[PDB]
Amino acid sequence: MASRILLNNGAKMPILGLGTWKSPPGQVTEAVKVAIDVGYRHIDCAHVYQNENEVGVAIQEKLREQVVKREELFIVSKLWCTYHEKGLVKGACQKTLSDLKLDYLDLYLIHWPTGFKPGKEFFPLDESGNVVPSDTNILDTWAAMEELVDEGLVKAIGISNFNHLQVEMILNKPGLKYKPAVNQIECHPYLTQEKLIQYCQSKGIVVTAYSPLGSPDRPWAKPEDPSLLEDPRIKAIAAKHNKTTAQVLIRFPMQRNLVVIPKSVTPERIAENFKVFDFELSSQDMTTLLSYNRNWRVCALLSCTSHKDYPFHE
Template sequence: MNSCSGTVTVLGSLCLITLQAPPGEVAEAVKAAITLGYRHFDCAYLYHNESEVGMGINAKIKEGEVRREELFIVSKLWCTYHKKSLVKTACTNTLKALNLDYLDLYLIHWPMGFKPGEKDVPLDCSGRVIPSNTSFLDTWEAMEDLVIEGLVKHIGVSNFNHEQLERLLNKPGLRFRPLTNQIECHPYLNQKSLIEFCHERNVSVTAYRPLGGSRNGVELMDNLVVQKIARKHGKSPAQILIRFQIQRNLIVIPKSVTPSRIRENIQVFDFELTEKDMEELLSLNKNLRLATFPTTEKHKDYPFHIEY
């Protein structure tokens, strides 16, 4: 897989979205992943587990199993911190929680700004998110300042559609281009147009939810095509879905806190899907989006009102 930074080889990625995990489970998952060879870890303020992620990372650094510069640590700016004066506060809070001096990559989690305050998703009486009067173009300027100050190495975005990304890339006075756009991506939502758009502009694509998930009783890993290809290669459906994205030149971030699954998810570099396999997986596209964030649909910057 291509390196995110040009200096770190990303052999696999672990997305630690473990909101309901018992205390200690996330730290142990991180430690197990580092031992297995993972060097890329995807975090976020919203996951509310960055201190545990940091415990796992720092334990392995202290043991001498890995050096900080061998790791690629990613986190994300949450929507209630889009005001320019709050961006640095959010970043330094994340660094403190992770017990790190810098991030390798910091993303704008969503293009939508929310009203600042104690609630992660502030809602009005009708159950709709309360927006802030911010623009992600202004938020980006504060993100660029983080690079200049040495708090982060690179910056990027997440859940941006092609129009929003184009606005950012064409922003007057742009100092740093987004390194990546992190988007939901799996065979039921293959994102072909958005991926082509990003790659044509030298913006990498990071695929979250690569294993899909359940919606309306639809479970991607139960798909007969996925299972047939898995049997053909002697691999699990999850390994097929991860390899599918790797061969599309994407950065893949499956999530798991189970050591056996963490191990399985990285064992995807000893086989290759055929052109026919890839075509069959691409043909499964249903434009089925799992992460829709319905309380934000009326927001001026809601990203999913257009095709891609």
């Protein structure tokens, strides 16, 4: 299987990338350096993760060392919810560029379809704990994203956590100039996403699977929760293939024509997670993994559920 997938902007995107949510700022520079040294060419970033400066130090050092050329890297970041206003989008993108020490992003995503009140707080709350919305709709935010392409700041734009009706809203936008290249959504054997993936792929939108290992370090983890890495059924498939459970969980979305972005700051695991191009899951393996769906989400947030554009009511 090829290492990159063709996007609808004409560029190629590596199907395996390194995630950086929760990667501590004192560890993520070495994580990204190791990742690039062992073959990763795609890093998934976001302003809200608060570690883009440190990710950028690694990228810049590997460019300076000539381990890789800039054109060989595929760097992704995301517009946070408090920057959905027309007059804030360019500055948000430029801050991310400055932190990552880049002149352009390969892909810039609307992180969530929900706009929040601008300000210093990433989750502005009213006194009862509800997030305070912005009245800026996803279509105007999309037009602002299109401007970034036309100013040379980003090569591609896309969306994240958009449900099928929200994707449709963008695709049906009056005067749409650029289609979204990517929809980045949660996807793993407990949230298999058949309907949304089919829809996006049918429209030429590439899907990126996040939390492919079930995000065991998510901060709201109840150890009551189901655990992909510990599921004996998935462990059995891994054993059959002489691979780790994580390697099976990463190969699974690859064989669905998805991009996948496992996170690690552990050098041994960063390398392990990349060694997934030399085995194949059978169709029976794939269908068996799909059968484990239970519509379980890592990423949901109670404080935002009354937002008009909350994506997971549908």
